[PDB]
């Protein structure tokens, strides 16, 4: 598990943005302040749900280890999702937000595989949850996860 000196410093910088009074904990109120600066307006119940899911020891506030543990997991999810989004843009040759059978067939060709229309149509139907005849990003991601 990688955590360099520089990575630790960056986590403390992010933590300090939340930890308004520098006591080493993040409360629901400090989280509200940050969320409002992002243009959101959560209720106290919503803030408590956000704290609760990060608050591993259940003492009501977020300490650095809890914060870093959650942030590192979120960063990995975001990295992984971005890799999936990049693949989707590559497959979606005309950039219209759907992978068509023809696009999928050309993709296969470029990867050294020759499929018939029949075979690619099958692959599309497999992923085409909403029945529009093509594969959108949500449908693609569902096949990856």
């Amino acid at each position: 598990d990688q955590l360099t000196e520089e990575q630790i410093a960056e986590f403390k910088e992010a933590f300090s943005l939340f930890d308004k009074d520098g006591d080493g904990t993040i409360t629901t109120k400090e989280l509200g302040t940050v969320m409002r600066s992002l243009g959101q307006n959560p209720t106290e119940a919503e803030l408590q749900d956000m704290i609760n899911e990060v608050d591993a020891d259940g003492n009501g506030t977020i300490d650095f280890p809890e914060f870093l543990t959650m942030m590192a997991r979120k960063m990995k999810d975001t990295d992984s999702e971005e890799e999936i989004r990049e693949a989707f843009r590559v497959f979606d040759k005309d950039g219209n937000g759907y992978i068509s059978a023809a696009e999928l067939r050309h993709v296969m060709t470029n990867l050294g595989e020759k499929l018939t229309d029949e075979e690619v149509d099958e692959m599309i139907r497999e992923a085409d949850i909403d029945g529009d005849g093509q594969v959108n990003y949500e449908e693609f991601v569902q096949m990856m996860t």
Partner: peptide, 20 residues
């Protein structure tokens, strides 16, 4: 006899292999 089908995940991973 029959043709084997490819998966969406295998396609994704095949691209992953070919990139720098």
């Amino acid at each position: 006899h029959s043709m084997q089908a490819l998966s969406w995940r295998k396609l994704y991973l095949s691209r992953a292999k070919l990139k720098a």
